[PDB]
Short mmCIF file of C-alpha atoms in Angstrom, two decimals:
data_model
loop_
_atom_site.label_atom_id
_atom_site.label_comp_id
_atom_site.label_asym_id
_atom_site.label_seq_id
_atom_site.Cartn_x
_atom_site.Cartn_y
_atom_site.Cartn_z
CA UNK A 1 -10.24 -4.67 5.76
CA UNK A 2 -7.65 -1.99 5.05
CA UNK A 3 -9.17 0.23 7.79
CA UNK A 4 -7.62 3.34 6.24
CA UNK A 5 -7.94 4.11 2.54
CA UNK A 6 -7.92 2.56 -0.91
CA UNK A 7 -5.92 4.07 -3.76
CA UNK A 8 -7.46 2.61 -6.90
CA UNK A 9 -5.33 2.40 -10.05
CA UNK A 10 -7.15 1.64 -13.30
CA UNK A 11 -4.81 1.12 -16.22
CA UNK A 12 -6.22 1.63 -19.71
CA UNK A 13 -5.14 -0.93 -22.27
CA UNK A 14 -3.50 0.07 -25.51
CA UNK A 15 -1.81 -1.35 -28.58
CA UNK A 16 1.92 -1.26 -27.90
CA UNK A 17 3.07 -3.33 -30.87
CA UNK A 18 1.59 -5.24 -33.78
CA UNK A 19 -1.40 -7.29 -32.59
CA UNK A 20 -0.25 -6.81 -28.98
CA UNK A 21 -1.70 -5.10 -25.91
CA UNK A 22 -0.80 -3.88 -22.45
CA UNK A 23 -3.86 -5.14 -20.62
CA UNK A 24 -5.73 -2.56 -18.57
CA UNK A 25 -6.26 -3.84 -15.04
CA UNK A 26 -8.64 -2.55 -12.38
CA UNK A 27 -6.74 -2.85 -9.09
CA UNK A 28 -7.18 -1.49 -5.56
CA UNK A 29 -4.47 -0.92 -2.95
CA UNK A 30 -4.61 -0.31 0.78
CA UNK A 31 -3.53 3.30 1.15
CA UNK A 32 -0.58 2.77 3.56
CA UNK A 33 0.76 0.04 1.29
CA UNK A 34 0.26 2.31 -1.74
CA UNK A 35 2.12 5.33 -0.38
CA UNK A 36 5.00 2.98 0.49
CA UNK A 37 5.38 1.26 -2.89
CA UNK A 38 3.87 2.24 -6.21
CA UNK A 39 5.70 2.13 -9.55
CA UNK A 40 2.96 3.73 -11.64
CA UNK A 41 4.04 6.49 -14.01
CA UNK A 42 3.55 6.81 -17.75
CA UNK A 43 1.36 3.72 -17.40
CA UNK A 44 -1.88 5.21 -18.81
CA UNK A 45 -3.90 5.05 -15.62
CA UNK A 46 -6.11 7.16 -13.43
CA UNK A 47 -6.27 6.97 -9.64
CA UNK A 48 -8.73 7.97 -6.94
CA UNK A 49 -9.01 7.35 -3.20
CA UNK A 50 -12.06 5.60 -1.78
CA UNK A 51 -13.21 4.52 1.67
CA UNK A 52 -13.99 1.05 0.29
CA UNK A 53 -12.08 -0.69 -2.47
CA UNK A 54 -13.64 0.41 -5.75
CA UNK A 55 -12.28 -2.40 -7.92
CA UNK A 56 -12.66 -6.16 -7.71
CA UNK A 57 -8.87 -6.68 -7.50
CA UNK A 58 -8.14 -5.81 -3.87
CA UNK A 59 -4.81 -5.62 -2.01
CA UNK A 60 -5.09 -5.31 1.76
CA UNK A 61 -2.73 -3.94 4.42
CA UNK A 62 -0.18 -6.76 4.13
CA UNK A 63 0.84 -8.17 0.78
CA UNK A 64 4.06 -6.42 -0.29
CA UNK A 65 5.86 -8.95 -2.52
CA UNK A 66 2.42 -10.05 -3.74
CA UNK A 67 1.63 -6.45 -4.71
CA UNK A 68 5.15 -5.54 -5.84
CA UNK A 69 4.64 -8.25 -8.46
CA UNK A 70 1.17 -6.95 -9.37
CA UNK A 71 2.03 -3.30 -10.12
CA UNK A 72 4.93 -4.23 -12.39
CA UNK A 73 2.42 -6.67 -13.90
CA UNK A 74 0.44 -3.65 -15.12
CA UNK A 75 3.10 -3.38 -17.85
CA UNK A 76 2.67 -6.99 -19.01
CA UNK A 77 2.53 -7.04 -22.81
CA UNK A 78 0.25 -9.75 -24.18
CA UNK A 79 -0.80 -10.47 -27.75
CA UNK B 1 -49.45 8.32 36.13
CA UNK B 2 -47.60 9.28 39.31
CA UNK B 3 -46.75 5.65 40.03
CA UNK B 4 -43.02 6.03 39.49
CA UNK B 5 -41.91 9.54 40.45
CA UNK B 6 -38.54 11.27 39.98
CA UNK B 7 -36.28 12.47 42.81
CA UNK B 8 -32.85 13.70 43.85
CA UNK B 9 -31.66 13.40 47.43
CA UNK B 10 -28.58 13.83 49.55
CA UNK B 11 -26.33 11.48 51.47
CA UNK B 12 -26.82 10.84 55.17
CA UNK B 13 -24.11 12.48 57.23
CA UNK B 14 -23.53 9.08 58.79
CA UNK B 15 -22.67 7.58 55.41
CA UNK B 16 -20.93 10.58 53.93
CA UNK B 17 -18.74 11.13 56.96
CA UNK B 18 -17.13 7.71 56.67
CA UNK B 19 -16.82 7.29 52.94
CA UNK B 20 -14.32 5.02 51.22
CA UNK B 21 -12.91 3.20 54.18
CA UNK B 22 -13.05 5.39 57.25
CA UNK B 23 -13.70 4.10 60.77
CA UNK B 24 -13.32 0.51 59.60
CA UNK B 25 -16.12 0.73 57.03
CA UNK B 26 -15.40 -0.49 53.52
CA UNK B 27 -16.64 -1.11 49.95
CA UNK B 28 -18.16 2.37 49.60
CA UNK B 29 -16.21 4.46 47.07
CA UNK B 30 -16.76 8.06 46.09
CA UNK B 31 -17.99 8.95 42.64
CA UNK B 32 -15.56 10.56 40.23
CA UNK B 33 -15.57 12.55 37.00
CA UNK B 34 -13.09 12.72 34.13
CA UNK B 35 -12.68 14.62 30.90
CA UNK B 36 -11.98 13.18 27.49
CA UNK B 37 -10.56 15.36 24.64
CA UNK B 38 -11.09 13.64 21.28
CA UNK B 39 -10.12 15.17 17.94
CA UNK B 40 -11.34 15.56 14.37
CA UNK B 41 -9.56 16.04 11.06
CA UNK B 42 -10.52 17.50 7.67
CA UNK B 43 -9.00 17.55 4.19
CA UNK B 44 -8.88 20.02 1.32
CA UNK B 45 -10.42 19.04 -2.02
CA UNK B 46 -9.75 20.64 -5.38
CA UNK B 47 -11.78 21.94 -8.30
CA UNK B 48 -10.99 23.37 -11.73
CA UNK B 49 -12.03 24.16 -15.33
CA UNK B 50 -10.64 25.06 -18.74
CA UNK B 51 -11.43 27.22 -21.74
CA UNK C 1 -7.25 27.12 5.93
CA UNK C 2 -3.60 28.01 5.50
CA UNK C 3 -2.15 24.51 5.30
CA UNK C 4 -4.12 21.49 4.11
CA UNK C 5 -5.95 19.31 6.58
CA UNK C 6 -7.13 21.31 9.53
CA UNK C 7 -7.99 19.59 12.78
CA UNK C 8 -10.26 20.47 15.69
CA UNK C 9 -10.38 18.85 19.09
CA UNK C 10 -13.41 18.28 21.30
CA UNK C 11 -13.38 18.06 25.09
CA UNK C 12 -16.17 15.85 26.38
CA UNK C 13 -16.61 16.01 30.13
CA UNK C 14 -17.26 12.36 30.94
CA UNK C 15 -18.03 11.01 34.36
CA UNK C 16 -17.94 7.68 36.09
CA UNK C 17 -14.16 7.28 36.57
CA UNK C 18 -13.64 6.14 32.93
CA UNK C 19 -13.22 9.11 30.59
CA UNK C 20 -13.16 6.72 27.61
CA UNK C 21 -15.42 3.72 28.10
CA UNK C 22 -18.40 2.00 26.57
CA UNK C 23 -21.44 4.15 27.20
CA UNK C 24 -19.90 6.53 29.75
CA UNK C 25 -22.30 9.39 30.35
CA UNK C 26 -21.20 12.86 29.28
CA UNK C 27 -21.21 15.37 32.10
CA UNK C 28 -22.56 18.67 30.83
CA UNK C 29 -24.70 17.64 27.91
CA UNK C 30 -27.28 20.07 26.50
CA UNK C 31 -29.57 17.16 25.65
CA UNK C 32 -29.26 14.95 28.70
CA UNK C 33 -29.63 16.18 32.25
CA UNK C 34 -27.28 15.70 35.17
CA UNK C 35 -28.02 12.50 36.98
CA UNK C 36 -29.93 13.94 39.86
CA UNK C 37 -28.25 11.99 42.67
CA UNK C 38 -24.68 11.10 41.73
CA UNK C 39 -22.80 13.06 44.30
CA UNK C 40 -25.72 12.25 46.54
CA UNK C 41 -27.30 8.97 47.62
CA UNK C 42 -26.19 7.52 44.29
CA UNK C 43 -22.64 7.27 45.59
CA UNK C 44 -23.60 5.67 48.91
CA UNK C 45 -25.69 2.88 47.39
CA UNK C 46 -26.10 1.57 43.85
CA UNK C 47 -29.58 1.93 42.56
CA UNK C 48 -30.98 -0.97 40.54
CA UNK C 49 -31.42 -0.19 36.87
CA UNK C 50 -35.02 -0.17 35.72
CA UNK C 51 -35.74 -2.79 33.09
CA UNK D 1 -8.02 11.61 41.10
CA UNK D 2 -6.21 12.75 37.99
CA UNK D 3 -2.71 11.52 37.16
CA UNK D 4 0.79 12.95 37.45
CA UNK D 5 1.94 11.47 34.14
CA UNK D 6 -0.97 13.24 32.45
CA UNK D 7 -0.52 16.78 33.73
CA UNK D 8 3.08 16.78 32.51
CA UNK D 9 2.32 16.01 28.89
CA UNK D 10 -1.13 17.60 28.67
CA UNK D 11 0.46 20.83 29.83
CA UNK D 12 3.16 20.27 27.24
CA UNK D 13 0.89 19.52 24.29
CA UNK D 14 -2.40 21.34 25.07
CA UNK D 15 -1.31 23.83 27.73
CA UNK D 16 -4.39 23.04 29.83
CA UNK D 17 -4.04 22.67 33.57
CA UNK D 18 -5.63 19.20 33.92
CA UNK D 19 -6.37 20.17 37.52
CA UNK D 20 -8.65 23.19 37.20
CA UNK D 21 -10.33 21.14 34.48
CA UNK D 22 -11.33 18.57 37.09
CA UNK D 23 -11.90 20.99 39.97
CA UNK D 24 -13.94 22.98 37.48
CA UNK D 25 -16.21 20.09 36.53
CA UNK D 26 -16.63 18.72 40.03
CA UNK D 27 -17.44 22.06 41.65
CA UNK D 28 -19.77 22.72 38.73
CA UNK D 29 -21.33 19.27 38.89
CA UNK D 30 -22.21 19.53 42.57
CA UNK D 31 -24.00 22.78 41.82
CA UNK D 32 -25.83 21.52 38.75
CA UNK D 33 -27.03 18.64 40.89
CA UNK D 34 -28.07 20.66 43.95
CA UNK D 35 -29.95 22.83 41.49
CA UNK D 36 -31.58 19.90 39.73
CA UNK D 37 -32.43 18.56 43.16
CA UNK D 38 -34.57 21.43 44.39
CA UNK D 39 -36.33 21.45 41.05
CA UNK D 40 -36.94 17.72 41.40
CA UNK D 41 -38.48 18.14 44.82
CA UNK D 42 -40.79 20.81 43.44
CA UNK D 43 -41.93 18.42 40.72
CA UNK D 44 -41.86 15.49 43.14
CA UNK D 45 -43.72 17.25 45.93
CA UNK D 46 -46.35 18.90 43.73
CA UNK D 47 -49.95 17.74 43.80
CA UNK D 48 -51.40 16.46 40.57
CA UNK D 49 -52.92 19.47 38.92
CA UNK D 50 -56.10 19.52 36.91
CA UNK D 51 -57.49 17.18 39.54
CA UNK E 1 6.83 13.37 -13.11
CA UNK E 2 6.77 14.04 -9.40
CA UNK E 3 3.31 13.56 -7.95
CA UNK E 4 2.21 15.71 -5.06
CA UNK E 5 -0.37 13.21 -3.91
CA UNK E 6 -3.14 13.42 -1.34
CA UNK E 7 -3.91 11.94 1.99
CA UNK E 8 -6.21 9.02 1.64
CA UNK E 9 -8.97 11.33 2.92
CA UNK E 10 -9.01 8.82 5.77
CA UNK E 11 -9.06 10.31 9.24
CA UNK E 12 -6.06 8.28 10.36
CA UNK E 13 -3.94 8.87 7.26
CA UNK E 14 -4.38 12.61 7.62
CA UNK E 15 -3.53 12.82 11.31
CA UNK E 16 -0.32 10.97 10.46
CA UNK E 17 0.54 13.09 7.44
CA UNK E 18 0.77 9.84 5.46
CA UNK E 19 0.33 10.73 1.80
CA UNK E 20 0.08 8.62 -1.35
CA UNK E 21 2.36 11.12 -3.08
CA UNK E 22 6.03 11.83 -2.60
CA UNK E 23 5.85 14.06 0.46
CA UNK E 24 4.54 13.11 3.92
CA UNK E 25 3.36 16.27 5.59
CA UNK E 26 3.97 17.17 9.23
CA UNK E 27 0.48 17.14 10.67
CA UNK E 28 -2.99 18.57 10.36
CA UNK E 29 -2.29 22.05 11.81
CA UNK E 30 -4.70 22.90 14.64
CA UNK E 31 -7.95 24.80 14.24
CA UNK E 32 -8.56 24.93 17.99
CA UNK E 33 -10.30 22.98 20.73
CA UNK E 34 -14.08 23.11 21.03
CA UNK E 35 -15.54 22.61 24.50
CA UNK E 36 -19.10 21.90 25.59
CA UNK E 37 -21.35 24.52 27.14
CA UNK E 38 -21.93 24.73 30.89
CA UNK E 39 -25.71 24.60 31.45
CA UNK E 40 -27.86 27.22 33.16
CA UNK E 41 -29.29 27.23 36.68
CA UNK E 42 -32.94 27.96 37.56
CA UNK E 43 -31.73 30.08 40.50
CA UNK E 44 -33.63 29.89 43.77
CA UNK E 45 -36.61 32.24 43.57
CA UNK E 46 -38.65 29.03 43.34
CA UNK E 47 -37.80 27.87 46.87
CA UNK E 48 -37.02 29.65 50.11
CA UNK E 49 -33.33 29.57 51.01
CA UNK E 50 -32.79 29.96 54.77
CA UNK E 51 -29.04 29.32 55.14
CA UNK F 1 -7.81 27.30 -16.81
CA UNK F 2 -8.47 27.83 -13.13
CA UNK F 3 -7.80 25.78 -10.00
CA UNK F 4 -9.15 26.16 -6.47
CA UNK F 5 -8.95 24.05 -3.35
CA UNK F 6 -11.29 24.33 -0.41
CA UNK F 7 -12.53 21.40 1.57
CA UNK F 8 -15.45 21.33 3.97
CA UNK F 9 -15.73 20.59 7.65
CA UNK F 10 -18.28 19.42 10.16
CA UNK F 11 -18.63 20.92 13.60
CA UNK F 12 -17.33 18.50 16.24
CA UNK F 13 -20.32 18.22 18.60
CA UNK F 14 -22.44 18.35 15.43
CA UNK F 15 -24.43 15.32 16.46
CA UNK F 16 -24.36 16.09 20.20
CA UNK F 17 -26.94 13.36 20.65
CA UNK F 18 -24.08 10.99 21.46
CA UNK F 19 -21.99 11.22 24.61
CA UNK F 20 -19.00 9.81 22.77
CA UNK F 21 -17.31 10.15 19.42
CA UNK F 22 -16.26 6.95 17.74
CA UNK F 23 -12.59 6.22 16.98
CA UNK F 24 -11.41 9.46 18.63
CA UNK F 25 -9.68 10.49 15.42
CA UNK F 26 -12.62 11.09 13.15
CA UNK F 27 -12.89 12.65 9.72
CA UNK F 28 -14.46 16.09 9.68
CA UNK F 29 -15.22 15.78 6.01
CA UNK F 30 -18.99 15.28 5.68
CA UNK F 31 -19.75 11.62 5.04
CA UNK F 32 -22.74 9.30 5.14
CA UNK F 33 -21.79 8.06 8.59
CA UNK F 34 -21.14 11.25 10.52
CA UNK F 35 -22.79 14.09 8.61
CA UNK F 36 -25.91 12.64 6.96
CA UNK F 37 -29.03 13.88 8.69
CA UNK F 38 -27.02 14.04 11.90
CA UNK F 39 -26.22 17.76 12.27
CA UNK F 40 -27.95 19.12 15.31
CA UNK F 41 -27.52 22.62 13.92
CA UNK F 42 -29.81 22.17 10.89
CA UNK F 43 -33.39 20.90 10.97
CA UNK F 44 -35.18 20.31 7.68
CA UNK F 45 -38.93 20.01 7.05
CA UNK F 46 -40.52 19.21 3.71
CA UNK F 47 -43.62 21.38 3.41
CA UNK F 48 -46.37 19.83 1.31
CA UNK F 49 -49.62 21.29 0.09
CA UNK F 50 -48.53 24.67 -1.22
CA UNK G 1 12.74 16.49 24.18
CA UNK G 2 10.33 19.06 25.59
CA UNK G 3 7.05 17.59 24.45
CA UNK G 4 6.42 13.85 24.11
CA UNK G 5 7.15 12.01 20.92
CA UNK G 6 9.33 14.06 18.63
CA UNK G 7 9.53 13.18 14.96
CA UNK G 8 12.36 13.45 12.43
CA UNK G 9 12.02 13.60 8.67
CA UNK G 10 14.26 12.20 5.96
CA UNK G 11 14.55 13.43 2.37
CA UNK G 12 15.74 10.75 0.00
CA UNK G 13 16.73 11.97 -3.43
CA UNK G 14 15.13 9.35 -5.67
CA UNK G 15 15.46 9.07 -9.42
CA UNK G 16 13.39 7.19 -11.90
CA UNK G 17 10.38 9.51 -12.16
CA UNK G 18 8.65 7.88 -9.16
CA UNK G 19 9.86 9.22 -5.82
CA UNK G 20 8.11 6.38 -3.98
CA UNK G 21 8.28 3.13 -5.92
CA UNK G 22 9.41 -0.45 -5.62
CA UNK G 23 13.19 -0.53 -5.66
CA UNK G 24 13.59 3.12 -6.63
CA UNK G 25 17.30 3.86 -6.67
CA UNK G 26 18.25 6.65 -4.30
CA UNK G 27 20.15 9.43 -6.00
CA UNK G 28 23.01 10.57 -3.78
CA UNK G 29 23.79 7.54 -1.68
CA UNK G 30 27.16 7.14 0.08
CA UNK G 31 27.06 3.38 -0.57
CA UNK G 32 26.06 3.42 -4.19
CA UNK G 33 27.60 5.32 -7.05
CA UNK G 34 25.33 7.11 -9.48
CA UNK G 35 24.51 5.17 -12.60
CA UNK G 36 26.94 6.94 -14.81
CA UNK G 37 24.78 6.95 -17.92
CA UNK G 38 21.28 7.86 -16.84
CA UNK G 39 21.46 11.36 -18.12
CA UNK G 40 23.45 9.78 -20.90
CA UNK G 41 23.15 6.89 -23.32
CA UNK G 42 20.95 5.05 -20.83
CA UNK G 43 18.12 7.46 -21.55
CA UNK G 44 18.41 7.06 -25.32
CA UNK G 45 18.37 3.25 -25.31
CA UNK G 46 17.54 0.75 -22.58
CA UNK G 47 20.34 -1.46 -21.50
CA UNK G 48 19.53 -5.07 -20.66
CA UNK G 49 19.99 -6.28 -17.12
CA UNK G 50 22.72 -8.80 -16.43
CA UNK G 51 21.49 -12.10 -15.03
CA UNK H 1 -9.01 8.06 38.23
CA UNK H 2 -8.39 9.93 35.01
CA UNK H 3 -5.55 8.16 33.25
CA UNK H 4 -3.06 9.88 30.98
CA UNK H 5 -2.39 6.88 28.81
CA UNK H 6 0.32 6.47 26.20
CA UNK H 7 0.65 6.32 22.50
CA UNK H 8 0.68 2.67 21.71
CA UNK H 9 4.39 2.93 20.87
CA UNK H 10 3.09 2.06 17.42
CA UNK H 11 4.61 4.24 14.73
CA UNK H 12 1.25 5.45 13.43
CA UNK H 13 -0.52 5.84 16.76
CA UNK H 14 2.13 8.36 17.71
CA UNK H 15 2.06 10.38 14.50
CA UNK H 16 -1.73 10.51 14.76
CA UNK H 17 -1.78 11.34 18.45
CA UNK H 18 -4.12 8.41 19.09
CA UNK H 19 -3.65 7.66 22.77
CA UNK H 20 -4.95 4.81 24.92
CA UNK H 21 -5.80 7.19 27.75
CA UNK H 22 -8.18 10.11 27.98
CA UNK H 23 -6.35 12.73 25.95
CA UNK H 24 -5.42 12.43 22.28
CA UNK H 25 -2.48 14.73 21.84
CA UNK H 26 -1.94 17.14 18.96
CA UNK H 27 0.99 15.36 17.40
CA UNK H 28 4.69 14.75 17.47
CA UNK H 29 5.86 18.32 16.81
CA UNK H 30 9.18 18.14 14.92
CA UNK H 31 12.78 17.29 15.78
CA UNK H 32 13.96 18.59 12.41
CA UNK H 33 14.68 17.21 8.96
CA UNK H 34 17.61 15.03 7.94
CA UNK H 35 18.84 15.30 4.36
CA UNK H 36 21.36 13.10 2.56
CA UNK H 37 24.85 14.40 1.87
CA UNK H 38 25.97 15.11 -1.70
CA UNK H 39 29.03 13.06 -2.76
CA UNK H 40 32.41 14.52 -3.65
CA UNK H 41 34.00 15.03 -7.04
CA UNK H 42 37.46 13.78 -8.04
CA UNK H 43 37.96 16.99 -10.06
CA UNK H 44 39.85 17.16 -13.33
CA UNK H 45 43.58 17.04 -12.63
CA UNK H 46 43.56 13.40 -13.76
CA UNK H 47 42.42 14.18 -17.31
CA UNK H 48 43.32 17.12 -19.51
CA UNK H 49 40.23 19.31 -19.74
CA UNK H 50 40.97 21.14 -23.00
CA UNK H 51 37.64 22.93 -23.49
CA UNK I 1 -37.30 50.93 -34.90
CA UNK I 2 -35.52 53.51 -37.02
CA UNK I 3 -35.04 51.25 -40.04
CA UNK I 4 -36.84 48.10 -41.19
CA UNK I 5 -35.64 44.76 -39.90
CA UNK I 6 -34.14 45.11 -36.44
CA UNK I 7 -32.05 42.34 -34.96
CA UNK I 8 -31.10 41.25 -31.44
CA UNK I 9 -28.27 38.93 -30.47
CA UNK I 10 -28.28 36.52 -27.58
CA UNK I 11 -25.25 35.17 -25.72
CA UNK I 12 -25.86 31.75 -24.24
CA UNK I 13 -23.16 30.71 -21.82
CA UNK I 14 -22.87 27.07 -22.83
CA UNK I 15 -20.64 24.60 -21.10
CA UNK I 16 -19.17 21.30 -22.10
CA UNK I 17 -16.62 22.33 -24.76
CA UNK I 18 -19.23 22.76 -27.55
CA UNK I 19 -20.69 26.26 -27.79
CA UNK I 20 -23.15 24.73 -30.26
CA UNK I 21 -24.17 21.09 -29.99
CA UNK I 22 -27.00 18.71 -29.17
CA UNK I 23 -28.50 19.60 -25.80
CA UNK I 24 -25.35 21.27 -24.51
CA UNK I 25 -26.50 22.72 -21.23
CA UNK I 26 -26.64 26.47 -20.74
CA UNK I 27 -24.51 27.74 -17.90
CA UNK I 28 -26.27 30.47 -15.97
CA UNK I 29 -29.90 29.55 -16.35
CA UNK I 30 -32.67 30.97 -14.15
CA UNK I 31 -34.57 27.67 -14.39
CA UNK I 32 -31.80 25.15 -14.02
CA UNK I 33 -29.30 25.11 -11.19
CA UNK I 34 -25.62 24.84 -12.08
CA UNK I 35 -24.53 21.25 -11.84
CA UNK I 36 -22.66 21.51 -8.62
CA UNK I 37 -20.01 18.93 -9.37
CA UNK I 38 -18.88 19.75 -12.89
CA UNK I 39 -15.73 21.51 -11.96
CA UNK I 40 -15.50 19.10 -9.08
CA UNK I 41 -15.75 15.33 -8.77
CA UNK I 42 -18.06 15.28 -11.79
CA UNK I 43 -15.03 15.93 -14.01
CA UNK I 44 -13.06 13.01 -12.57
CA UNK I 45 -15.70 10.36 -13.31
CA UNK I 46 -19.02 10.17 -15.13
CA UNK I 47 -21.77 9.41 -12.69
CA UNK I 48 -24.27 6.83 -13.90
CA UNK I 49 -27.45 8.46 -15.11
CA UNK I 50 -30.45 7.68 -12.96
CA UNK I 51 -33.12 5.85 -14.92
#
């Protein structure tokens, strides 16, 4: 487990362009990893801490490059 | 039922005199006591409204 | 609370040579009494636990 | 048997003596036992009442 | 859009000042150390003394 | 609009039925683990039949 | 060092709206020059990376 | 044998005061903050200002 | 009543952004307690109704 805290980012999907979306993604982050690296701003989200991970997408103490690719994936634009 | 009673007694001055390796005796340590000192932590939470 | 996140310590008086240990009795505990012979005969010999 | 590496830093961080904390809880523990002893012998040595 | 952020509300994250926001605070102040009471004696009127 | 910040705390020694705290750095925010039904300072009795 | 375990802070000036973020360019960095249009044209339109 | 213990030399276990021994210290205190120096301008003598 | 047809106003303190609406709860109500997280956590999320 993370053993500390879970910062839980839930992005809310939206229509960016014609027949295109930025898919909203429920994701959880181990708190020490989150405070170190998070790119989220202007991303149409809302965040809350929780003792246990509150979303089915869970990132533990050690991922880094696995998570660094997931947060910038919150901006992925799909049709 | 009085079968198993409850006591407190001393230590014989033959045992207490030589205690923890005096006069060649051995294996009989004294009892000790420590202290611990553990901490707690709290956080401030917010609250708010609008009109 | 002037700055966020207060903290408060707690000093447990724990005896048995291990201040922090599994199940190490607390010394002055309002609930639980002092073990009657600890200083006393309890230190000379080890009494068999009752099970 | 406290430690010399403790009293340095515990005096630095908490300001406590780390000696008079032990001498306080040993000298208090021998008394709380010698007091719980002569209550235990009263309860030990008492006849069964209502008999 | 600088975020102030919170501690995780975890007990470890607070004691470290670790904070999901920009700033990592110093520490969780101190609200003071709580000790445990020293229990009361029954005195000796119950049993003759005879030093 | 108004904003306030307070936070709550639990008395270390609250439980007092345990000779040891767990983890030795322990959240004083009331939680299910530490603060639920475990305060020795408060004792609650549901009265029925009134 | 009077008390054990001192601690030193560091204030990075970070730009890009997210003080703590993956690869968030530090503002005033002796190594790295400031991106000369950030204030400027670079805010109006987005320039493509060079790969 | 009350042991003073150490922080684990871990970076968190120090900032939290978690300590392997009896006492969990307050925290690190502070050795002071380190900021980053602001770079230097080349001024204007190389290009006619002409407001 | 000095003239036919008196009238009496009533000020409901109604919360939830709609002074008039379907079942918009009244604020200070002798019957009903104030929902104690409305300002608080209750404004961050919507807690699932219990059914």
